[PDB]
């Protein structure tokens, strides 16, 4: 019902030739003319006509016409009338197997793009026609149709069930082309089926036996693409249907071991993944019993840098082998050392740097699983690695930074002058390496060391800050991020020691300079603001000269992220949803300012809409947003409650709804906020207690709840009982056991103090304490340095229980430190 005319054809052919001209500007001119014509449907009818039917014209003009149309599909398919679209569809399927490889590639890319963009529900007979075309006599047609089906399976596998269950016909049919004579078709066949293994697609699982028998029959295929796809198949079958591989495990392991050494590096990388996946299964040790002795040297050998990467310098046989060795070391732990140590001896001291490098990487990879077993060798290895940090080849320096980092805990545990002092000295020198890959390795290692050492670095603080600040001049972009993180960690590790004028004036200027440089859309803000958050908590009162623009920018980031989210929610096809990391980062930095500046932030908050913005952040679908806003709420509750008090009526029900322990961090920050709000509410928190308490009690008696959530729940229940004993005390019998067991283990501080005066007051029902009194006695003995008020309180309840003497039988079940501290402080 549409046919071309010579005038229109000549203009298109003219325009298509012109688009192939070599000249500088005629190409920019032809694109503006295509831009205009692209939105006219009759033009796309001409494009597909040139591709499939103008066999007079050459191949490059025909296929370029098809590719321009492909771009129009990707952009304007919505606007295509159902008569142009059907004409393109029919011509594609009818020329799926053209004799020209370039034309055939172009038709398929059309098919594939219409199928995805425009959605398969709207091309109902595509899959049946493609499947019928698979049975064709002509090879190119069968190959081209299978080419399309494979792209479609890779792109749209998630349409298994409602076209209407097409996989129930295709998958059984793909399995029949595993035996096909042409290796190309065979690859397509198992490539298609591989898309549906992890899904446990019903059509495939009910044919799992035919699948497995056809895979075995294909194992010795000489064509790499088959071997590779057979290897992929076996690795996924390992994850979902281990049951049916079990009777063949010995031959499969034997096969994968051979393929892990394949001459084709892509085959070997697919094979190598088998070991990663097998290590997770509980059957691992039993299965590998006869092959582990060869697997370990095979893995270690593939960890060397390939020759290409050697010259160049992302996932490859090196990383995969290393990852496998890491997991295996975790599975076998010390049993692995007799396999690894001879290799390590032959590699760590080798004359050829590529070999030695791989030795050092082995040493780091096994560190976590084999740590205990290698303690005896560390007094020799660690001084050796510190010497390698000065090795002449950069890649040896950078891997040595890493594996030293993997032994940081052992190093901090030894006398600081022996290993820690020299390691840190030469890591700092390495920070200023001239090679960018070493900078990033040494910086990351140093961060790792900072986290392990904590206050052990305070004597070195000035020299660390000299090195870290200097790096601002040498680093740009990619390692500045690592550098910010090293500064953030330093601030978390030495805390308030950072708060000295010499340090502040050395560190802030370059931090603010990179701050003024970045704009509100740059994701580089994430490490910078997370760094400033840590710096502000450490610098506390000394951050005051810098906080004003820092605060107002964070509130701005939250405000714009909320507004963009609401816009996107309003018209999603016109406005893109915002990255809510900007908001999470910005909330956390405000938490850092409120913790660090304390009361000094109130003048900033008094002039802000942060609480109105916090109200909406607390209700966000995403947990990390809720988690950061509740953390900010507790911090503002401490710093400037004057401004929070009017909002409590609205915040409390929302805090009540986020006492859900499936989200640990949200649940935790919510409970902590409730506690801090209590202390400043006073008796006025009476009406809000029914909204939280019954769940808090359920949370504190829930098994396999992380210790930190339990202590915060204990501290909040204590604080709520200090403030309104009337409605809290009835539950004493129901939570005192886990309360005492958890709070027994926290340092004597203001939260501990606040919580224990709460338990004392709950004086209001002493009968809730009796049947489990052993736990309270222990909990009060946990106190080393209690302030006098709390001591006086403590003597009263213990002496009161005594007077109900007869108790000595019970009191002798005390361990000796328990019984003796109670007599020492309180005289019972």
């Amino acid at each position: 019902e549409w046919k071309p005319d010579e005038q229109g054809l000549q203009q298109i052919l003219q325009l298509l030739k012109e688009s192939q001209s070599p000249d500088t500007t005629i190409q920019r001119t032809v694109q503006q003319k295509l831009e205009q014509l692209n939105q006219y449907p009759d033009f796309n009818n001409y494009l597909i006509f040139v591709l499939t039917k103008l066999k007079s014209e050459d191949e490059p003009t025909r296929s370029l016409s098809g590719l321009i149309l492909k771009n129009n599909v990707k952009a304007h398919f919505q606007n295509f009338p159902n008569g142009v679209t059907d004409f393109i569809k029919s011509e594609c399927l009818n020329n799926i197997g053209d004799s020209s490889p370039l034309i055939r590639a172009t038709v398929g890319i059309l098919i594939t793009t219409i199928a995805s963009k425009g959605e398969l529900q709207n091309w109902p007979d595509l899959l049946p026609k493609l499947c019928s075309l698979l049975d064709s006599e002509d090879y190119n047609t069968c190959e081209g149709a299978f080419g399309a089906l494979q792209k479609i399976c890779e792109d749209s596998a998630e349409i298994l069930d409602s076209l209407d269950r097409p996989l129930n016909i295709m998958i059984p049919k793909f399995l029949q082309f595993f035996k096909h004579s042409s290796p190309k078709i065979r690859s397509h066949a198992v490539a298609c089926v591989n898309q549906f293994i992890i899904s446990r697609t019903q059509a495939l699982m009910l044919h799992i036996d035919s699948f497995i028998e056809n895979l075995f029959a294909l194992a010795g295929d000489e064509e790499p693409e088959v071997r590779k796809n057979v290897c992929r198949a076996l690795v996924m079958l390992l994850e979902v249907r281990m049951d049916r591989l079990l009777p063949h495990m010995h031959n499969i392991v034997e096969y994968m071991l051979q393929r892990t050494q394949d001459q084709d590096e892509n085959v070997a990388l697919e094979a190598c993944e088998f070991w990663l996946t097998l290590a997770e299964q509980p059957i691992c040790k039993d299965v590998l019993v006869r092959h582990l002795p060869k697997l370990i040297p095979v893995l270690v050998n593939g960890m060397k840098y390939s020759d290409i990467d050697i010259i160049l310098l992302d996932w490859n046989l090196r990383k995969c082998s290393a990852a496998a060795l890491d997991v295996l070391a975790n599975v076998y732990r010390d049993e692995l050392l007799p396999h690894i140590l001879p290799l390590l001896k032959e590699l760590l001291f080798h004359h050829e740097w590529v070999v030695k490098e791989s030795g050092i990487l082995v040493l780091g990879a096994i560190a976590e699983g084999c740590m205990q077993g290698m303690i005896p060798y560390l007094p020799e290895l660690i001084p050796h690695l510190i010497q390698c940090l000065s090795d002449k080849k950069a890649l040896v320096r950078s891997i040595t930074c890493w594996t030293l980092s993997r032994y940081a805990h052992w190093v901090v545990s030894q006398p600081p002058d022996t290993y820690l002092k020299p390691l840190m000295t030469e890591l700092l020198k390495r920070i200023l390496d001239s090679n960018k890959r070493v900078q990033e390795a040494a910086c990351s290692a140093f961060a790792t060391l900072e986290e392990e050492a904590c206050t052990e670095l305070v004597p070195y603080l000035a020299y660390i800050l000299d090195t870290l600040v200097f790096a601002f001049s040498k680093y740009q972009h990619k390692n500045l991020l690592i550098l910010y993180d090293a500064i953030g960690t330093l601030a978390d590790s030495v805390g308030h020691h950072l708060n000295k004028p010499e340090y502040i004036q050395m560190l802030m200027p370059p931090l603010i300079q990179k701050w003024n440089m970045l704009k509100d859309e740059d994701k580089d803000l994430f490490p910078l603001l997370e760094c400033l958050s840590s710096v502000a908590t450490a610098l506390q009162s000394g951050f005051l000269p810098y906080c004003e623009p820092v605060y107002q920018r964070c509130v701005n980031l939250v405000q714009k992220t909320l507004a963009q989210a609401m816009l996107n929610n309003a018209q999603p096809d016109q406005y893109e949803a915002p990255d809510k990391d900007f908001m999470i980062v910005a909330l956390d930095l405000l938490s850092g300012l409120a913790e660090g500046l304390g009361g000094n932030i109130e003048q900033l908050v008094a002039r802000s809409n942060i609480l109105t913005l916090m109200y909406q952040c607390m209700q966000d679908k995403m947990p990390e947003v809720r988690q950061s806003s509740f953390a900010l709420l507790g911090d503002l509750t401490k710093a400037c409650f004057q401004h929070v008090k009017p909002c409590i009526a609205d915040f409390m029900p929302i805090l009540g709804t986020n006492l859900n322990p499936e989200f640990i961090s949200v649940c935790n920050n919510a409970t902590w906020a409730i506690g801090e709000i209590s202390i400043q509410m006073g008796i006025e928190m009476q009406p809000y207690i029914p909204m939280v308490l019954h769940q808090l009690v359920e949370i504190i008696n829930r098994p396999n709840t992380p210790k930190t959530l339990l202590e915060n729940t204990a501290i909040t229940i204590g604080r709520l009982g200090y403030v309104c004993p009337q409605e809290v005390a009835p539950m004493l019998q129901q939570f005192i056991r886990p309360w005492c067991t958890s709070l027994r283990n926290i340092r004597d501080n203001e939260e501990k103090d606040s919580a224990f005066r709460g338990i004392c007051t709950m004086s209001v029902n002493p009968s809730g304490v009796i049947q489990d009194f052993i736990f309270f006695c222990d909990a009060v003995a946990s106190w080393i340095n209690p302030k006098d008020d709390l001591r006086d309180m403590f003597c009263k309840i213990l002496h009161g229980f005594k007077n109900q003497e007869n108790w000595r039988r019970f009191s002798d079940q005390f361990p000796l430190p328990l019984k003796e501290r109670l007599a020492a402080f309180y005289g019972v």
Partner: peptide
């Protein structure tokens, strides 16, 4: 303690690693 930062996890994930 009291309250969960989640900042350390973010720094660990940006850290350099050979695999």
């Amino acid at each position: 303690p009291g309250k969960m930062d989640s900042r350390g996890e973010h720094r660990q994930d940006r850290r350099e690693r050979p695999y």
